[PDB]
Amino acid sequence: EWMPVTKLGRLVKDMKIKSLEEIYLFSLPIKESEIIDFFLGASLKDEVLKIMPVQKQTRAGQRTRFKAFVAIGDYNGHVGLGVKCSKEVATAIRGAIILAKLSIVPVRRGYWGNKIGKPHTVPCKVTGRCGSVLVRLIPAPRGTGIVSAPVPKKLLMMAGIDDCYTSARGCTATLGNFAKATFDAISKTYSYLTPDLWKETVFTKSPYQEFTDHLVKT
């Protein structure tokens, strides 16, 4: 069973947090993947993007560990990416899945043209960067699919995007930097100020402030 070790985890297991977007609203760090299991565990799907052997030269020889890149997310606007290096492939993949769970960010979706129906593309042109890898996401007409390389295509599909134009510059062969740049571009979708977000912020009580009295007696 799950025993939380953090205040936020105890609040989550107490059924006092109504949604994961409420945790995102205050940008609180998530350090227990069980929170993501609690909130989106019924819809999350993970995918091992890559396994690569990394070698450290030693006196005896070459010590080889394995680095696992795993992209997780539900196809409704939550995606995360996790990289874990470990001695064995199985535990590397387990840790990568856990890390991808911990890094799940909300994805903002928008409309290329008319605003009929549900959002389908990125709200605006966004860009992610990771060590010479440049990944640009451009809104695309409804029904055009994701025009991207297979790795950013996986990351974008897992994030709930179904129409997107993509551009990549740099050493995109390095799947790790390509995936991290795509994840950064996705994460920037909610950090881009748009004229519909000009409405003044109406602040709400923090999860900790609202429920401190709950643990004041406890």
Binding site: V48, L49, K50, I51, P53, T64, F66, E88, V89, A90
Partner: peptide
């Protein structure tokens, strides 16, 4: 998780069959 290909890769991470095992491990 499939362990057979993981062991085959861990025996020799850069052998003749390294590419196929790594590709099979991806998905």
């Amino acid at each position: 998780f499939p362990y057979e290909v993981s062991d085959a890769l861990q025996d020799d991470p850069k052998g003749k069959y390294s590419k196929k095992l790594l590709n099979k491990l991806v998905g």
